[PDB]
Design an enzyme around this catalytic site. Sequence first.
Site, PDB file in Angstrom:
ATOM      1  N   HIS A  95       1.378  -1.279  -0.057  1.00 35.57           N
ATOM      2  CA  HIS A  95       0.345  -0.400  -0.145  1.00 35.57           C
ATOM      3  C   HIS A  95       0.248   1.019   0.151  1.00 35.57           C
ATOM      4  CE1 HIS A  95      -3.786   2.468   1.582  1.00 35.57           C
ATOM      5  NE2 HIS A  95      -2.552   3.177   1.279  1.00 35.57           N
ATOM      6  N   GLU A  96       2.324   1.445   0.845  1.00 36.73           N
ATOM      7  CA  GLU A  96       2.719   2.667   0.786  1.00 36.73           C
ATOM      8  C   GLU A  96       3.294   2.966  -0.091  1.00 36.73           C
ATOM      9  OE1 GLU A  96       0.853   2.520   4.448  1.00 36.73           O
ATOM     10  OE2 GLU A  96       1.576   4.197   2.879  1.00 36.73           O
TER      11      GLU A  96
ATOM     12  N   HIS B 107       1.538   4.571  -2.802  1.00 33.27           N
ATOM     13  CA  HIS B 107       1.921   6.341  -2.607  1.00 33.27           C
ATOM     14  C   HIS B 107       3.100   6.901  -3.191  1.00 33.27           C
ATOM     15  CE1 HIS B 107      -1.561   6.601  -0.679  1.00 33.27           C
ATOM     16  NE2 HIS B 107      -1.247   5.892   0.874  1.00 33.27           N
TER      17      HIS B 107
ATOM     18  N   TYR C   7     -11.780   2.004   2.866  1.00 32.62           N
ATOM     19  CA  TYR C   7     -10.198   2.844   3.087  1.00 32.62           C
ATOM     20  C   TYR C   7     -10.003   2.975   1.601  1.00 32.62           C
ATOM     21  CZ  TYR C   7      -6.765   5.034   4.536  1.00 32.62           C
ATOM     22  OH  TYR C   7      -5.237   5.791   3.965  1.00 32.62           O
TER      23      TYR C   7
ATOM     24  N   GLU D  68      -5.643   7.390  -1.767  1.00 30.76           N
ATOM     25  CA  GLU D  68      -5.827   6.291  -1.230  1.00 30.76           C
ATOM     26  C   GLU D  68      -6.870   5.791  -2.162  1.00 30.76           C
ATOM     27  OE1 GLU D  68      -4.473   6.135   1.848  1.00 30.76           O
ATOM     28  OE2 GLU D  68      -4.315   8.307   1.935  1.00 30.76           O
TER      29      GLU D  68
HETATM   30  C1  LIG Z   1      -0.763   1.041   6.582  1.00 30.04           C
HETATM   31  O1  LIG Z   1      -2.642   1.833   6.636  1.00 30.04           O
HETATM   32  C2  LIG Z   1      -3.367   2.300   6.158  1.00 30.04           C
HETATM   33  C3  LIG Z   1      -3.953   3.752   6.728  1.00 30.04           C
HETATM   34  C4  LIG Z   1      -2.836   4.699   6.718  1.00 30.04           C
HETATM   35  C5  LIG Z   1      -3.653   5.677   7.104  1.00 30.04           C
HETATM   36  C6  LIG Z   1      -2.917   7.388   6.977  1.00 30.04           C
HETATM   37  C7  LIG Z   1      -3.406   8.159   7.094  1.00 30.04           C
HETATM   38  C8  LIG Z   1      -3.018   9.446   6.941  1.00 30.04           C
HETATM   39  N1  LIG Z   1      -2.591   9.991   5.360  1.00 30.04           N
HETATM   40  C9  LIG Z   1      -1.868  11.700   5.418  1.00 30.04           C
HETATM   41  C10 LIG Z   1      -0.500  11.876   5.539  1.00 30.04           C
HETATM   42  C11 LIG Z   1       0.994  11.897   5.021  1.00 30.04           C
HETATM   43  C12 LIG Z   1       1.890  11.483   5.068  1.00 30.04           C
HETATM   44  C13 LIG Z   1       2.302  12.167   6.495  1.00 30.04           C
HETATM   45  F1  LIG Z   1       3.289  11.991   6.446  1.00 30.04           F
HETATM   46  C14 LIG Z   1       1.048  12.152   7.377  1.00 30.04           C
HETATM   47  C15 LIG Z   1      -0.323  12.083   7.104  1.00 30.04           C
HETATM   48  C16 LIG Z   1      -2.427   5.257   5.001  1.00 30.04           C
HETATM   49  O2  LIG Z   1      -3.390   5.320   4.555  1.00 30.04           O
HETATM   50  N2  LIG Z   1      -0.999   4.634   4.640  1.00 30.04           N
HETATM   51  O3  LIG Z   1      -0.609   5.578   3.930  1.00 30.04           O
HETATM   52  C17 LIG Z   1      -3.615   1.466   6.058  1.00 30.04           C
HETATM   53  C18 LIG Z   1      -4.226   0.695   4.157  1.00 30.04           C
HETATM   54  C19 LIG Z   1      -5.258   0.031   4.005  1.00 30.04           C
HETATM   55  C20 LIG Z   1      -5.837   0.102   4.940  1.00 30.04           C
HETATM   56  F2  LIG Z   1      -6.790  -1.320   5.073  1.00 30.04           F
HETATM   57  C21 LIG Z   1      -5.786  -0.461   6.711  1.00 30.04           C
HETATM   58  C22 LIG Z   1      -4.490   0.504   7.010  1.00 30.04           C
HETATM   59 ZN   LIG Z   2      -2.223   5.270   2.745  1.00 30.86          ZN
END
Ligand SMILES: CO[C@H](C[C@H](CCCCNCc1ccc(F)cc1)C(=O)NO)c1ccc(F)cc1
Ligand SMILES: [Zn+2]
Length: 512
Positions: free
Chosen positions: A422-423, A426, A464, A471
């Site tokens: 996932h990351e 991005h 999500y 996302e």
């Molecule tokens: C792995 O974690 C994710 C959730 C996690 C939530 C974090 C939300 C923050 N987004 C804005 C942001 C970006 C960079 C920064 F420095 C500060 C703020 C995520 O999406 N990571 O990419 C996740 C994805 C799928 C899932 F099913 C559960 C969790």
């Molecule tokens: Zn994310």
Amino acid sequence: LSRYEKWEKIKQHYQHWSDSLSEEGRGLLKKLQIPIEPKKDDIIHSLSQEEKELLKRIQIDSSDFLSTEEKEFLKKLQIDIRDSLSEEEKELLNRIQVDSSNPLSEKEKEFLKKLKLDIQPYDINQRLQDTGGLIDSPSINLDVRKQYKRDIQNIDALLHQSIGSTLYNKIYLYENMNINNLTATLGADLVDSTDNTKINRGIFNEFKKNFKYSISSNYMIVDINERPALDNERLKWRIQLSPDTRAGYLENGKLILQRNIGLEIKDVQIIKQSEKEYIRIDAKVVPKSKIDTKIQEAQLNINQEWNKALGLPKYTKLITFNVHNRYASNIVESAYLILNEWKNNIQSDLIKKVTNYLVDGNGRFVFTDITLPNIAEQYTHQDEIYEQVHSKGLYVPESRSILLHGPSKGVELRNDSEGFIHEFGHAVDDYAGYLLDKNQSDLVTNSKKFIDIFKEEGSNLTSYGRTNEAEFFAEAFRLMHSTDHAERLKVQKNAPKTFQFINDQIKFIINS
Ligand SMILES: CO[C@H](C[C@H](CCCCNCc1ccc(F)cc1)C(=O)NO)c1ccc(F)cc1
Ligand SMILES: [Zn+2]
């Protein structure tokens, strides 16, 4: 010894120390054992009427940026604000969190992001664990940060008396632990789902396989005599101290240990106590420096391996272990497995092209067991605490870094490798956008083309994924590179424009 003879011998060893504590000293130790909670009444009183109404109806578990502790507090807060209302309202606002599991509105988000600043308990042990001892990390108010430092310095000074050469090899100390405090991912499946008296043998093997060392960044509070487990305590640590281990006696037959402890894991076994299975963890205290040497040697090793695999210069610092807590060795060893899965499931040219972009920007893959707001690759760029996030993983474009928090579990993720992927999604979004216009650098998900795609297909994948364009892209990317072929096929079938768009961007990247 005799359980009570051991207790009385340890209490005697520390009796002068105990009798000598100042009122200040006793107060610190009390605070450490039992943290002071924020005042719910005062928090609620400080809110505007609109903010109160907003807080009443907010789906707290739909937020993506709060710690478990922050969430649970906000829930308790929410109970109080709702209590003026009535049963139907109360019963209603309270069971369409079924399929409704919608992303928060921007208004809800901005409110909660500032409100979390006001809900922090003063908790010395939690502060040390969350920061891995990096207590200057700018993730809480500065004045509170300073008080923590003063208190921690004073506690360190209090805990000056070692257990000694007489007692250290004549006694065991004990700690019951919820497995969810080491690994929420394995914790979910540790207990046999049909018979609570049993441990799942496959999960047990996963749990112990790479569990060889452990760090306590906070002050361990250990039992002199083993206490029967409460329902959620399936780990039973049995601990041997070193002669130089500093500690203090606490009432009711406990010791508080000095912080910054290393532990070698000597044995991990399923045992039976009163017709139920538990995991015995036998651990021996060693200097923390001995454990840090092992972590640093592993960091060198994993970079030497991956720099070669990725065609990077051998000296490249790509992978970092920011490791400070009780499942330390698993954070380290699981990184090899996570990166293996990443390489297995994504085209080699894509991984090389994107990773080179990250490295060109001094990017890192950070594997950690401290909370993400306390990782510099995040906080150096999010100076507002309200914008700092704790989550399973993160991608920070400003530091070109992927962060992955070991101890937690992502709700719709099976494992750590899915989070990492996932990351990386991005990172792909970032690099694809950079290629579009190297001069004004934006994400590819901010293109009008993808915005239109998101408006059409954004609800067709994960819950999500609905959150926003970035996302959605990352979720579609992750699912397209799942080990489960059915998940890859679902993206192709249910989000065909997104499937096409991502494959097109992958070609653009590989061809740059
Ligand atoms: C792995 O974690 C994710 C959730 C996690 C939530 C974090 C939300 C923050 N987004 C804005 C942001 C970006 C960079 C920064 F420095 C500060 C703020 C995520 O999406 N990571 O990419 C996740 C994805 C799928 C899932 F099913 C559960 C969790
Ligand atoms: Zn994310």
